[PDB]
Ligand binder design. Structure first.
Ligand SMILES: NC(=O)C1=CN([C@@H]2O[C@H](COP(=O)(O)OP(=O)(O)OC[C@H]3O[C@@H](n4cnc5c(N)ncnc54)[C@H](OP(=O)(O)O)[C@@H]3O)[C@@H](O)[C@H]2O)C=CC1
Ligand SMILES: NC(=O)C1=CN([C@@H]2O[C@H](COP(=O)(O)OP(=O)(O)OC[C@H]3O[C@@H](n4cnc5c(N)ncnc54)[C@H](OP(=O)(O)O)[C@@H]3O)[C@@H](O)[C@H]2O)C=CC1
Ligand SMILES: O=C(O)CCC(=O)C(=O)O
Ligand SMILES: O=C(O)CCC(=O)C(=O)O
Ligand SMILES: [Ca+2]
Ligand SMILES: [Ca+2]
Ligand code: NA
Ligand code: NA
Lengths: 407, 411
């Protein structure tokens, strides 16, 4: 009945797919009508269309400014045999992120009754990681035997091509890889980082390994520092916050013993990994939001940070009972819809967005939660069946709670 | 007085250099005589020898089979300016690890009175991280403007040349790099991992991102699997343990919520970073061992995993009282000497090494400790001067306790 606007939706795989459908059936569709542009990133369909469906979904997001994505399978060899795939398709996440660009901001979803693994974290940690380039765009290969691996730069302006020696393999083979990043993208990431910091009133840290990657990482470090000095510094001081670069070793240690309450700017690989470390440290991988904010200020893709949860899905196929946390998948929808509402100045969509979220927190805070969350309070071995609901029960319960509150 | 043998010693920088001298002077030299082959990896001395001293140290370690290393500054632009360096020298750790090769095993040092940051870790987590290649021997450069970055392989015979497009820079510039690893080194790293799992009777996890780096990381995953199946699987099933690959994201989450009690094989970068996170989670960076175990099975370099503690050094330079935890540095010596002893079948030195370890734990467990550890107990905002000992005080107390312990043993 509520008029949503246009949303790009990406369907995914395995356990998350199951959950994705439950969320549309019970939390979204009964209450909200949309111009839904649906792309199926299920791995069967991606194989069928030779991954073209993925490039299509990314373009759709540019047009419509808003995307909600279910977790997908990125195939290695086992996966190729499993689904009889054409080939080892690349990560859709990496494909879409590289086309859209921007910064991925992740943040735990906090309930008051859910204890943390790490004692100190009483304030949020917001991770914003660079979406573009590096490992997702890397070229890696097997080195078959002895020989020489080199990397070369040929300037477009006709001046001398430059060649560096990567390694001389003199005994057997191995592996080698090239990767890159772009100044403009890195600039965008710096501004997005400083702006999020000002926005929250929290200090900003950048982590790199510039002592080791002196040129590659030093470039991130320099770009951040240049832009800070020229463009944000006084505004930081005015708010009594700060920016500082830290080596990645020190940062992860610092973060661990911290009391939280900062923005953590990461390179792509570190953002990907440290975001799992942090979600789990607050409680669970089901309790983290993830939004890609594009450089335009306008476009957004929301998702759950975690994967398809194949381990739980395997039980589901064997007919056994499961308890998977859908909270993150649900916030992919509320964050996306929130943004849609703010774009269109849709007063009611915004209301629904925020309702489903407080409904989610309120349900867990009343004592209805999936197995992972009960494990947080009790310790896994002390958890009994009466302590949690299963995937379907819990979805139903949120469903009836949404009913009551919207009514 | 104990006859030590030949040890290759590598001297360092900043706060650890100070602590290094205190350890030698108060814990080692009073009791042990050594054929010390001393290499000064202080940054001034590396700059004066164009870093040749670091390669010499490494070569000395092949020859003598044991090395003990102090934390070193790895310079970036700020350090060049600070020390007026000729160049931004490469990490001595990378240099040494790539010359020797092998697997770096890192583990927390645990005291019964010290709370953890992470609740569940009632057993230890042992990380074995590949010492060779990757980021540490990378070639990286700034791309100054539009143009094409390519990476090429040419076989030794010259019979063929393979060119891969890395990126087409048309817009402006950026950065690019290449990195590499070798199969032999990866096979040695698999072996040490499975052996360490068997040794401890714990399960082994390997982490990669093979879904994203399909050839590079998939090479690691495959070598480990093939080697598991053919050579260690019977044995693993016998002690009722197991081996699995996990994706690095899943693995860090799994470690976080776990009970501990596993071996975690890591790629170079991940090992380097997660070992800090792990040490901190058990309570302190001062409380972790690190030994490079070479594939020859005979050669070892022991070190402190943390850095030079530059921030504590600044205070020291101002005359301000400091409290830096020396435990990891002391254990560089104790692990090195324990291995020298094992090599030489030397029971006096073996006994000494282990005696210095117990003394370290006993002193802390009796409530004498540096500030980081007192913060573990009280919470940083709650700790007062009376709660901890300063750097020299704590060293002097261990010195006393070591004297007692060795005396009681002589009796
Ligand atoms: N599209 C995407 O954004 C992502 C996709 N992937 C893909 O997903 C697939 C599986 O990835 P994988 O590394 O196995 O791990 P997943 O992140 O899917 O899950 C791994 C483990 O994390 C815990 N976990 C994750 N989500 C939940 C949840 N919602 N509720 C409770 N526990 C959860 C579970 O622990 P436990 O088993 O102990 O209960 C689970 O087994 C792979 O194909 C991978 O490529 C991976 C990451 C992100
Ligand atoms: N040689 C080596 O193996 C390594 C060398 N390095 C080099 O060390 C230098 C400094 O690196 P950086 O990352 O800043 O810092 P370090 O790793 O030396 O330490 C940074 C912070 O960690 C805490 N810490 C580390 N060790 C101790 C200790 N033993 N006792 C108490 N606290 C400790 C301190 O926290 P707090 O300030 O909060 O009290 C300290 O400020 C750099 O030049 C780097 O290149 C870095 C890593 C390894
Ligand atoms: O795309 C993938 O295969 C993994 C993505 C991921 O883990 C993430 O985006 O955090
Ligand atoms: O060599 C460096 O600069 C840092 C090394 C390091 O952090 C480590 O060995 O854990
Ligand atoms: Ca991840
Ligand atoms: Ca480290
Ligand atoms: Na499971
Ligand atoms: Na300090």
């Amino acid at each position: 009945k509520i008029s949503g606007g246009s949303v790009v939706e990406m369907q995914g795989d395995e356990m998350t797919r199951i959950i994705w459908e439950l969320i549309k059936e019970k939390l979204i569709f009964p209450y909200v009508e949309l111009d839904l542009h649906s792309y199926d990133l299920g791995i069967e369909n991606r194989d069928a269309t030779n991954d073209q469906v993925t490039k299509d979904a990314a373009e759709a997001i540019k047009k419509h400014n808003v995307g909600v994505k279910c977790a997908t399978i990125t195939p290695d060899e086992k996966r190729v045999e499993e689904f009889k795939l054409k080939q080892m398709w690349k990560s859709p996440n990496g494909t879409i992120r590289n086309i859209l660009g921007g910064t991925v901001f992740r943040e735990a979803i906090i309930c008051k009754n859910i204890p943390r693994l790490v004692s100190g974290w009483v304030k949020p940690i917001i991770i914003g990681h660079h979406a573009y380039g590096d490992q997702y765009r890397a070229t890696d290969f097997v080195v078959p035997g002895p020989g020489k691996v080199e990397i070369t730069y040929t300037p477009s302006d006709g001046t001398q091509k430059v060649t560096y020696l990567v390694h001389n393999f003199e005994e057997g083979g191995g592996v080698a890889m090239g990767m890159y990043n772009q100044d403009k993208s890195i600039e965008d990431f710096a501004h997005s980082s400083f702006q999020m910091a000002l926005s929250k009133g929290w200090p900003l840290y950048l982590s790199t390994k510039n002592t080791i990657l002196k040129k590659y990482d030093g470039r991130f470090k320099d770009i951040f520092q240049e832009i800070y000095d020229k463009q944000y510094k006084s505004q930081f001081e005015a708010q009594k916050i700060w920016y500082e670069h830290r080596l990645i070793d020190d940062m992860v240690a610092q973060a661990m013993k911290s009391e939280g309450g900062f923005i953590w700017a990461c390179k792509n690989y570190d953002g990907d990994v440290q975001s799992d470390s942090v979600a789990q440290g607050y409680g669970s991988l089901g309790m983290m939001t993830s939004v890609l904010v594009c450089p335009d200020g306008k476009t957004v893709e929301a998702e759950a940070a975690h994967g398809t949860v194949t381990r739980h899905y395997r039980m589901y196929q064997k007919g056994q009972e499961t308890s998977t946390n859908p909270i993150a998948s649900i916030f992919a929808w509320t964050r996306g819809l929130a943004h849609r509402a703010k774009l269109d100045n849709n007063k009611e969509l915004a209301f629904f967005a925020n309702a489903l979220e407080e409904v989610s927190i309120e349900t867990i805070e009343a004592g209805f939660m999936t197995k992972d969350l009960a494990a947080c309070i009790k310790g896994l071995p002390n958890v009994q069946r009466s302590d949690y609901l299963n995937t379907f029960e819990f979805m139903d319960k949120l469903g009836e709670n949404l009913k009551i509150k919207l009514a």
